């Protein structure tokens, strides 16, 4: 019954959570000591074992799911910020959803999972093409909406104690930078591409 967006919201919410953990591990935002290997998408991934960090990531993506359901999300961006709170690297997930359709949990769900696995695999080897980040980096998640975020400024307030707000220009601005394509996928319920924007000189 036109459950296309709902399934994508769930599938993507779960994928993005795994993707954020892996990114944090491969970009050394936190020590390898807090990560533990897990099995996701039939592939070995590194997941954090710190409750607070885990809850933070969960809450973040929990709030994005409703926006995904209404297909108001243009991009979900995992941003790595330096000590000066300026973007050093950006993992951009650009999302496009086809018109609503009624999906039957069978092969289409497993097909989408197989396509998402390629993204996990690419993120896992990104440290081979990216220069190491300077010490002191932190991270955040940015959500680009198709319409003014002001309209979705209330739809995203899914959780109390976990408010969202409009981002600044600095939190997004990057000179140049170096662009690295990772993977693109197409399917009946989701079209998505992931690429990284890296600061030219990390010093």
């Amino acid at each position: 019954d036109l459950n296309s967006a709902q399934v994508v919201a769930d599938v993507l919410s779960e994928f993005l959570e795994v993707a954020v953990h892996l990114i944090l591990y491969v970009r050394e935002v936190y020590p390898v000591g807090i990560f533990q290997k897990r099995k996701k998408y039939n592939v070995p991934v590194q997941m954090s074992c710190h409750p607070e960090l885990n809850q933070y990531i969960q809450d973040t993506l929990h709030c994005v799911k409703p926006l995904l359901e209404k297909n108001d999300v243009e991009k979900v961006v995992v941003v790595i910020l330096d000590k000066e709170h300026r973007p050093v690297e950006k993992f951009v997930f650009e999302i496009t959803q086809p018109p609503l359709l009624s999906i039957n949990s069978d092969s289409l769900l497993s097909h989408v999972e197989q396509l998402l696995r390629a993204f996990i695999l690419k993120i896992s080897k990104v440290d081979k093409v990216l220069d190491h980040n300077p010490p002191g980096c932190t991270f955040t998640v940015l959500v680009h909406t198709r319409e003014a975020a002001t309209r979705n400024m209330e739809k995203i307030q899914v959780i109390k104690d976990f408010p969202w707000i409009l981002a600044d220009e600095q939190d997004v601005h990057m000179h140049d930078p170096r662009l690295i394509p990772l993977k693109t996928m197409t399917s009946d319920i989701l079209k998505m591409q992931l690429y990284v924007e890296e600061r030219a000189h990390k010093n």
């Binding site: 002191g136 940015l142 909406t145």
Partner: peptide, 21 residues
């Protein structure tokens, strides 16, 4: 305008290291 971000910051590397030790 059309970019949203969480108000709260994730736990710092320092808080993480504090738990590991």
């Amino acid at each position: 305008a059309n970019i949203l971000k969480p108000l709260m910051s994730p736990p710092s590397r320092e808080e993480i290291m504090a738990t590991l030790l």
